[PDB]
């Protein structure tokens, strides 16, 4: 079923701060030190964006007050082969980039059942400027800071993964494990609009998701 | 140093190729070999020279690991190809540090938890294989005994590795685009020199080669008393 | 996953013409383990070849060494032909004497 | 009354393209050559962002299918002292920046009643990168390209204005005419999330607005 | 060139200061002055030297503009201070280009549309003032006659400005921070030289001054046959 | 709107000691038109002062010229004191001979 959602953004997760750049996980290895979301070993992806959510408002396709649904059976968030959170809704956005490469962003609304912390290689998006009408793209810094990111029991989080897929466009959910790519153009899409600078505390972010 | 075992199983081996082979290591040196075709735990390198109870016990242990590794492919729903890799071993802490990790088709998905004496993992593949191995007689019990007692004690016994070999050095100038420091047959493999690469030799020594886009080269190795310069 | 093999060709000892030596083709960091490797003398398959046990590194990618006993000269060219799933075309890596 | 809205994004308005940076108006002069939205001469602001909207879905506070409301009486979009569009819903977002400067972004959902074109000094936001944990801000290019932007009769548009206000925080709607400021930090807020790169065609953007 | 009129009205003038004053220009030269205190259209500069019907007609016209400009403050809901500025004039095209714009408290909000013969604007302030001026006898009719016939014809008559004056030049070196080219009394004001600024003189000439952070200076002016260098 | 006045102090002719000349204080680009300007000799208010008509430029900001007939010397300091709404403190701009 399709559920429309209103996510109330909480405080930024350290090292993110209120008026600074948003730091997202970049590397996908070592496998036991990164957060993975998926069905099985051949169907999963590694998170980049993490955002604390303090209140979730549930709506149906017909926009009526809905009650918090059960987690989607099968989807899970794991750290070092151990499930740490349940996924309640998800959505994947695909947008073409170069006629043979598409940006595919997966967004997961999760609730952490067991608190955990990771120590990942973080980075942030950026775009340079030139005094010309020339195209300037959004890229990841290609440099990484090694720092700890913490997730608390009972809290709800919005996790995102963005990969670039080469070839014909895929139909159905695309599972793909890939780090953020150096010197590669990215466009802000429906899934990473909140990953430039942190959304204001108590502001609301909207999604149309599947359960 | 370390005592590690590299377990590998494949669902569809090539003709005349083992479906499950093992390599045993004491640091950078391999001392044990095993494969499903021979079914024998055999010595490697200088370890061939001497008793029989030790190698007989290892052969039976690796046959049980072979049965479980092949059993894992059946535990998964049959759809090839499959590759199960295992990393079992330990190190002698100041104590011990065990290692037990498994990968399915190159993806890390399981371990062996030491608190709950079984194989840990919440992936749908790690819940079926860890089940099947648990459903085998005393399989988990032996693994806990190996990772915490047998491996550390076996390492302590062997420490009652030190052989050194200085690297032969050569420095040559290739035809650089308009406008190579290599070391041969050194041991231990720890050695520092641009774009260096590192690899082994058939005799157990090692080989490294770094070239810079252009002068002397500096080498530091455990077989050399002091770092040595290199001339063209 | 699938990973392409990194191929290095080097000798056990520094190469002198006329003396017996060993030629190594170190293939590392590939996955899956299914790999076909040959050592070539003047583009032809050397039949006397030995290879070590197939192991894997910390990222679970396989590495393995192909070696032969050979006598280098200045008119004999040696190379390593490697074929893998990630290769629609087998790669041939010639042996530089000093690498 | 508070109306929640679902804006279906159309094609980018030239010179904006599908996978390039979003160009927004920067300068606010000459007064007759720029788009102004407001009540009177002392209550108005100059647009920066412009986005074509192809379908508007109307909802109340209680999330029920609502019909297209009448324009808010008094608010208008003018070019050279002539009204060219009606405003149907609006919302203003205020977020602190330096404890004495706030970023105030006003978002207007308009329908053009008479087609017009302007020739403004456009620019785009950007953020540099450094190999340090140092803070990198989002700034306007400070360079401008003089080019024509066209608005068609009967179409619906999403217009935005962003100003930086110094002093105590303001209560109620803040009217302020100010160009985008050189070498001045900006944070993407609820009103400019869609002004980095154009939203995908037929994708939906959500707002909570007043009428 | 141009014939332009600068209209200005203030709701709260300073003591002994006009509430509505006008300046008339023929290009860079001012020829007419007016203010509410005197109520007379008076010559400026060299235009003082000669007939009476022309200046008498201008005085009555500017009194009507004064009544409307003060009437505009009443049309707006009384809440001071207020400032009404008007720019009325034209230019002799190859034809004519009229100009009619008004600003309230420094904000452009109104004009005079030439298709619909009235004052144009959709601001709530421009709908009240344009109404009130329209509600005055033949006020809009005269404005259309001035912008399209009277101003262009008056410019054609005067063209049946050319006086030149070379700039005296000085170049001096000030105490620059550890580690100025000025032109005096030139006309016409068009002149090119860093960080130059531009201003008028009381006699009708102009003055410019550009200094560069540090060499000779170059000046080009309509009173000079060819550009002239400047020495320290 | 409100805008601050740009103030320039310069002479009609290049300054020679002993000869009669004119001193100009060009105040431009301010709004509203209410402005108070004085010309100072050694910090004291010059009473013989004339100012042109108050006009405005293309951005509707007012400009106007204050001038006096004076005789420059090397011991007399001249300046312009300007006060405006945008100024909580009146500004005094000294006269540089060459500007």
Curated annotation (Swiss-Prot), chains B, E:
In residue numbers, the region (Alpha-1) covers 1-81
Q: Name one GO molecular function term.
A: IgG binding
Ig-like C1-type domain location is 166-231
Membrane topology category: Single-pass type I membrane protein
Identify the stretch(es) annotated as Alpha-3: 165-232
Q: Which GO terms of type biological process are on file?
A: IgG immunoglobulin transcytosis in epithelial cells mediated by FcRn immunoglobulin receptor; immune response
Q: Which GO terms describe its cellular component?
A: endosome membrane; external side of plasma membrane; extracellular space
Question: Looking at the keywords, is Membrane present?
Answer: yes
| Residue spans, topological domain Extracellular | 1-232
The SS bond pairs are 90-151, 181-217
Assembly, in brief, is: FcRn complex consists of two subunits: p51, and p14 which is equivalent to beta-2-microglobulin. It forms an MHC class I-like heterodimer. Interacts with albumin/ALB; this interaction regulates ALB homeostasis.
What does this protein's UniProt record list under function? Answer: Cell surface receptor that transfers passive humoral immunity from the mother to the newborn. Binds to the Fc region of monomeric immunoglobulin gamma and mediates its selective uptake from milk. IgG in the milk is bound at the apical surface of the intestinal epithelium. The resultant FcRn-IgG complexes are transcytosed across the intestinal epithelium and IgG is released from FcRn into blood or tissue fluids. Throughout life, contributes to effective humoral immunity by recycling IgG and extending its half-life in the circulation. (Microbial infection) Acts as an uncoating receptor for a panel of echoviruses including Echovirus 5, 6, 7, 9, 11, 13, 25 and 29.
> Belongs to which family?
Belongs to the immunoglobulin superfamily.
Would you tell me the protein name for this molecule? IgG receptor FcRn large subunit p51
The organism is Homo sapiens (Human)
Swiss-Prot record, chains C, F:
Keywords recorded for this protein, A-Z: Amyloid, Amyloidosis, Disease variant, Disulfide bond, Glycation, Glycoprotein, Immunity, Immunoglobulin domain, MHC I, Pyrrolidone carboxylic acid, Secreted, Signal
Q: Which residues are glycosylated?
A: 1, 19, 41, 48, 58, 91, 94
UniProt modified residues of type Pyrrolidone carboxylic acid: 2
The answer to whether UniProt assigns keyword Ubl conjugation to this entry is no
S-S pairs: 25-80
The cellular location(s) given in this protein's UniProt record come to:
Secreted; Cell surface
PTM per Swiss-Prot/TrEMBL: Glycation of Ile-1 is observed in long-term hemodialysis patients.
Q: Name one GO molecular function term.
A: protein homodimerization activity
Q: GO biological process: what's one of them?
A: negative regulation of receptor binding
Q: Name one GO cellular component term.
A: Golgi membrane
According to the record, mutating residue 60 to V results in: Increases tendency towards amyloid formation
Q: Classify the main location.
A: secreted
Q: Which domain of life is it from?
A: Eukaryota
What residue stretches are annotated with the Ig-like C1-type domain? 5-93
Q: Which residues cross the membrane?
A: none
Keyword Secreted in record:
yes
**Which disease annotation does the entry carry?**
Immunodeficiency 43: A disorder characterized by marked reduction in serum concentrations of immunoglobulins and albumin, and hypoproteinemia due to hypercatabolism. Patients may suffer from recurrent respiratory tract infections and severe skin disease.
Functionally, this protein is described as follows:
Component of the class I major histocompatibility complex (MHC). Involved in the presentation of peptide antigens to the immune system. Exogenously applied M.tuberculosis EsxA or EsxA-EsxB (or EsxA expressed in host) binds B2M and decreases its export to the cell surface (total protein levels do not change), probably leading to defects in class I antigen presentation.
Q: What's this protein's family per the entry?
A: Belongs to the beta-2-microglobulin family.
* Assembly behavior: Heterodimer of an alpha chain and a beta chain. Beta-2-microglobulin is the beta-chain of major histocompatibility complex class I molecules. Polymers of beta 2-microglobulin can be found in tissues from patients on long-term hemodialysis. B2M alone (not in complex with HLA-I) interacts with M.tuberculosis EsxA (ESAT-6) and an EsxA-EsxB (CFP-10) complex; the tripartite complex can be detected in the host endoplasmic reticulum. The B2M-EsxA complex can be detected in patients with pleural tuberculosis and is stable from pH 4.0 to 8.0 and in the presence of 2M NaCl.
Q: What is this protein called?
A: Beta-2-microglobulin
Give the stretch of the parent protein shown, with its full length. Answer: 21 to 119 of 119
């Amino acid at each position: 079923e399709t559920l429309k959602v209103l996510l109330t953004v909480g405080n930024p997760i350290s090292p993110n701060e209120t008026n600074k750049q948003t730091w997202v996980n970049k590397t996908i290895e070592p496998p036991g030190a990164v957060v993975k979301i998926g069905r099985d070993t051949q169907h999963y992806c590694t998170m980049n964006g993490f955002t604390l959510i303090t209140k979730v408002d549930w709506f149906t396709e017909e926009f009526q007050p809905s009650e918090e649904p059960a987690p989607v059976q099968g989807l899970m968030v794991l750290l070092d082969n151990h499930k740490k959170a349940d996924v309640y809704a998800a959505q994947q956005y695909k947008n073409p980039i170069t006629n043979d490469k598409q940006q595919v962003t997966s967004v997961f609304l999760v609730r952490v059942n067991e608190g955990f912390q990771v120590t990942n290689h973080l980075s942030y998006f950026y775009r340079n400027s030139v005094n010309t009408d020339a195209v300037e793209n959004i890229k990841i810094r290609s440099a990484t800071r090694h720092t700890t990111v913490r997730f608390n029991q009972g809290s709800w989080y919005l996790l995102t993964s963005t990969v670039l897929h080469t070839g014909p466009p895929v139909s159905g959910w695309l599972w793909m494990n890939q780090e953020l790519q150096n010197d590669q153009a990215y466009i802000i899409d429906q899934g990473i609009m909140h990953l430039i600078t942190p959304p204001p505390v108590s502001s609301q972010i909207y999604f149309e998701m599947a359960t | 140093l370390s005592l590690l075992y590299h377990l590998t199983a494949v669902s569809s081996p090539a003709p005349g190729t083992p479906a499950f082979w093992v390599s045993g290591w004491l640091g950078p040196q391999q001392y044990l070999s095993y494969n499903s075709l021979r079914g024998e735990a055999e010595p490697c390198g200088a370890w061939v020279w001497e008793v029989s109870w030790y190698w007989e016990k290892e052969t039976t242990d690796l046959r049980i690991k072979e049965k479980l590794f092949l059993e894992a492919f059946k535990a998964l729903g049959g759809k090839g190809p499959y590759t199960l890799q295992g990393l079992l071993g330990c190190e002698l802490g100041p104590t011990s540090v065990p290692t037990a990790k498994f990968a399915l088709n190159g993806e890390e998905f399981m371990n062996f938890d030491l608190k709950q004496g079984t194989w840990g993992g919440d992936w749908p593949e790690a819940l079926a294989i860890s089940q099947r191995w648990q459903q085998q007689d005393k399989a988990a019990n032996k693994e806990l005994t190996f990772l915490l007692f047998s491996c550390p004690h076996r390492l302590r016994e062997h420490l009652e590795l030190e052989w050194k070999e200085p690297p032969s050095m050569r420095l040559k100038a290739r035809p650089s685009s308009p406008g190579t420091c290599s070391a041969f047959s050194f041991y231990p493999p720890e050695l520092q020199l641009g774009q260096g690469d590192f690899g082994p030799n058939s005799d157990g020594s090692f080989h490294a080669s770094s070239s810079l886009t252009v002068y002397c080269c500096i080498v530091q190795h455990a077989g050399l008393a002091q770092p040595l310069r290199v001339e063209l | 996953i699938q990973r392409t093999p990194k191929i290095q060709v080097y000798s056990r000892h520094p190469a002198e013409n006329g003396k017996s030596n060993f030629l190594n083709c170190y293939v590392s960091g590939f996955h899956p383990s299914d790999i076909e490797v040959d050592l070539l003398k003047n583009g032809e398959r050397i039949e006397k070849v030995e290879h070590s046990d197939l192991s894997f590194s910390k990222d679970w990618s396989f590495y393995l060494l192909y070696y032969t006993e050979f006598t280098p000269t200045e008119k004999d060219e040696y190379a390593c032909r490697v074929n893998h799933v990630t290769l629609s075309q087998p790669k041939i890596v010639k042996w530089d004497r000093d690498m």
